[PDB]
Amino acid sequence: GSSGFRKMAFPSGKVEGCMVQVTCGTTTLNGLWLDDVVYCPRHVICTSEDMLNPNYEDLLIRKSNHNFLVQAGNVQLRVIGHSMQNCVLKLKVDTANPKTPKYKFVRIQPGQTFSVLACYNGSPSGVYQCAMRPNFTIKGSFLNGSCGSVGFNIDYDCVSFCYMHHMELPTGVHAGTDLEGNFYGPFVDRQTAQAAGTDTTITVNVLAWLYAAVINGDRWFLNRFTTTLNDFNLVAMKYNYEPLTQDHVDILGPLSAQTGIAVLDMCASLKELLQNGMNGRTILGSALLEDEFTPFDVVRQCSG
Amino acid sequence: FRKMAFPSGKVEGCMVQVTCGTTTLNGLWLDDVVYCPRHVICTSEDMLNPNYEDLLIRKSNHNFLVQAGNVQLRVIGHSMQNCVLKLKVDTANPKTPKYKFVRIQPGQTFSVLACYNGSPSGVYQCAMRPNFTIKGSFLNGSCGSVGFNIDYDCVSFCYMHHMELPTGVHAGTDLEGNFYGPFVDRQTAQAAGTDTTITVNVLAWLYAAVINGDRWFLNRFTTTLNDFNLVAMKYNYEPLTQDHVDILGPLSAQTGIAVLDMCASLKELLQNGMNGRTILGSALLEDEFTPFDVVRQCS
Ligand SMILES: Cn1cnc(Cn2c(=O)c3c(=O)n(C)c(-c4cc(C#N)ccc4Cl)cc3n(Cc3cc(F)c(F)c(F)c3)c2=O)n1
Numbered sequence: 001g002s003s004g005f006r007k008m009a010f011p012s013g014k015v016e017g018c019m020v021q022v023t024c025g026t027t028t029l030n031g032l033w034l035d036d037v038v039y040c041p042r043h044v045i046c047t048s049e050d051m052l053n054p055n056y057e058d059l060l061i062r063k064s065n066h067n068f069l070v071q072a073g074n075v076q077l078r079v080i081g082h083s084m085q086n087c088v089l090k091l092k093v094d095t096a097n098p099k100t101p102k103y104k105f106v107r108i109q110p111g112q113t114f115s116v117l118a119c120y121n122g123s124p125s126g127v128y129q130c131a132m133r134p135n136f137t138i139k140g141s142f143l144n145g146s147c148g149s150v151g152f153n154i155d156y157d158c159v160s161f162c163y164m165h166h167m168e169l170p171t172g173v174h175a176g177t178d179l180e181g182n183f184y185g186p187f188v189d190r191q192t193a194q195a196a197g198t199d200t201t202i203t204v205n206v207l208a209w210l211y212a213a214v215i216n217g218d219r220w221f222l223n224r225f226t227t228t229l230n231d232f233n234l235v236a237m238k239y240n241y242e243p244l245t246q247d248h249v250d251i252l253g254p255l256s257a258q259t260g261i262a263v264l265d266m267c268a269s270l271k272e273l274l275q276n277g278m279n280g281r282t283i284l285g286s287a288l289l290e291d292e293f294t295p296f297d298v299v300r301q302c303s304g
Numbered sequence: 305f306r307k308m309a310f311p312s313g314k315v316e317g318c319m320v321q322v323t324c325g326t327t328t329l330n331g332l333w334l335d336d337v338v339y340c341p342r343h344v345i346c347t348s349e350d351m352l353n354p355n356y357e358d359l360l361i362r363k364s365n366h367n368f369l370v371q372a373g374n375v376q377l378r379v380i381g382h383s384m385q386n387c388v389l390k391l392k393v394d395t396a397n398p399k400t401p402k403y404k405f406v407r408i409q410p411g412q413t414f415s416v417l418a419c420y421n422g423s424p425s426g427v428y429q430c431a432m433r434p435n436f437t438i439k440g441s442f443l444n445g446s447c448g449s450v451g452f453n454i455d456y457d458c459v460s461f462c463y464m465h466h467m468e469l470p471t472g473v474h475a476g477t478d479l480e481g482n483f484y485g486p487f488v489d490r491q492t493a494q495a496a497g498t499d500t501t502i503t504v505n506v507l508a509w510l511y512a513a514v515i516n517g518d519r520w521f522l523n524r525f526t527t528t529l530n531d532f533n534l535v536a537m538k539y540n541y542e543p544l545t546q547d548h549v550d551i552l553g554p555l556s557a558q559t560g561i562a563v564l565d566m567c568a569s570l571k572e573l574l575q576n577g578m579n580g581r582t583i584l585g586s587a588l589l590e591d592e593f594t595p596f597d598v599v600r601q602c603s
């Protein structure tokens with residue numbers, strides 16, 4: 001049929017050119033170097049004696065510039081200023097990053113997707129795509145030493161940084177901040193076991209992925225039941241799916257036009273899947289309903 | 305575990321576009337040579353069965369438009385090597401990474417940088433299927449996009465995309481222009497043969513499950529390699545080679561589970577099914593993570 005379907009990340013080169021390593025004493029993690037400032041998680045100034053409940057502002061006033069070792073590949077960068085914005089440490093260095101891309105800091109909404117460049121000791125190791133969960137965690141793939149890896153989207157030639165990785169929660173999901181240092185979700189940069197709120201499924205993204213499945217020739221789940229938007233949302237909420245808004249229906253328009261399947265008709269298919277299950281069948285090779293592709297992700301991949 | 309691509313920056317810096325007339329596709333610029341599919345020299349009249357030798361004889365350096373963005377790179381020599389065109393240019397790419405060309409085996413995974421008009425659009429992980437296709441994601445204009453692995457600072461290029469087959473899977477060559485599989489670069493009826501399951505990767509996935517403490521399927525037996533291979537083929541699984549056994553060695557050592565004991569465990573799963581149980585939260589056995597991917601991603 002059409003031309004295949006995969007989780008796809010943005011090319012990571014523009015972000016790779018910004019990754020550095022930041023060390024405080026025995027403590028090492030990753031930083032992001034843009035112009036003459038390096039941004040990283042402030043937890044780097046804590047020690048194991050501090051980590052349970054750090055007083056960051058005490059820790060920082062006791063710091064000197066020379067306490068921070070910033071390395072870009074093989075070159076050591078001189079720190080000539082330091083400050084802290086929320087949970088992000090900013091180190092001013094005496095040289096600009098020549099590879100600084102055009103960029104913006106943005107705070108993303110639950111449901112939106114982004115790419116993550118996982119790094120260790122300042123070196124990029126892998127790229128993958130994630131979503132901000134409705135409970136403001138992310139289901140990433142990160143190991144010890146990934147602290148400071150960033151998430152982003154690319155538009156034309158501009159990198160929108162939206163995430164900086166801080167921690168792994170006990171359930172194995174991940175928590176972090178925007179680039180102003182504000183956590184997504186109710187989390188705190190202390191080494192304490194932290195639970196997230198109950199998660200829900202991102203309905204508009206499931207619908208977008210069902211439209212991808214149709215574009216790829218997988219149509220077994222379609223039906224002719226009718227639904228209104230309100231009645232679809234009542235069933236959705238019953239199954240811990242997020243509400244679908246009229247803005248969602250509008251954003252699904254291009255996918256609906258391309259496949260000739262009305263958005264509310266696709267909702268009636270999803271309603272049936274939620275009530276009856278998949279009967280051990282798959283959709284796009286998946287046994288589960290996938291909710292980490294946005295409408296934009298689908299269109300870009302299947303039309304653009 | 306999840307599927308990760310390699311950081312794509314080293315390959316991004318090698319992508320260019322190649323145009324002949326009104327036809328444009330992607331090329332790879334390493335040192336002073338640009339590599340691209342030779343299909344670029346065909347017209348819509350040539351496509352069913354092109355005479356590539358003839359079409360190339362009629363080409364001169366001045367007929368090829370190579371661009372890095374809007375910047376044209378002057379072509380100073382051309383040749384064809386199997387199904388790849390090689391265009392020598394007058395500028396060595398200053399972003400050339402350390403690199404090798406390698407030809408991979410079925411089962412091996414790699415990252416694809418999908419590009420359109422020389423501009424990278426996205427990166428994803430893929431496996432070479434046993435039928436020598438990939439289940440990629442590509443649109444028209446993606447011809448010449450490449451697949452690669454990175455080891456330390458070195459980029460091992462293993463795939464250059466040529467075409468989509470009627471089932472929507474993809475076919476291409478190595479960087480010496482030799483197709484994976486029986487495919488040819490012309491618009492004919494060619495079809496992917498029936499595919500099979502990549503046994504060595506399933507085994508690596510079971511090892512990953514064990515490492516993470518998910519070990520219910522470890523049965524009390526062992527098997528010979530021959531008996532396992534004969535049973536595997538009955539379930540449309542690939543037979544294991546001696547090289548597969550060897551690449552499983554680091555996971556076998558890490559878990560203390562002999563390769564042939566894990567084979568016996570998989571044999572029971574094939575013969576009996578899951579009983580409704582899951583492995584790593586999946587009712588399905590995954591066959592697109594290699595033993596390297598498990599090592600790479602658990603560490
Ligand atoms: C398994 N895994 C998956 N993702 C991760 C990411 N990941 C790391 O990369 C990492 C690291 O590299 N490092 C280095 C430290 C660290 C340890 C000490 C000590 N003793 C002091 C400072 C730090 Cl930053 C903590 C880290 N932590 C714990 C942590 C991180 C925080 F920013 C935080 F505010 C908090 F309260 C706790 C972490 O979660 N791990």
Ligand SMILES: Cn1cnc(Cn2c(=O)c3c(=O)n(C)c(-c4cc(C#N)ccc4Cl)cc3n(Cc3cc(F)c(F)c(F)c3)c2=O)n1
Nearest residue numbers: 003343344348442443444445446447466467468489490491
């Ligand atoms: C939906 N989709 C998914 N993957 C793709 C990749 N994809 C392209 O990107 C693409 C392209 O960009 N282009 C430009 C051409 C093209 C057309 C003409 C004409 N007329 C002449 C030369 C070429 Cl290279 C053919 C292409 N083809 C067809 C093709 C490509 C071959 F190299 C080949 F040997 C063959 F016999 C047939 C293709 O498959 N498309």
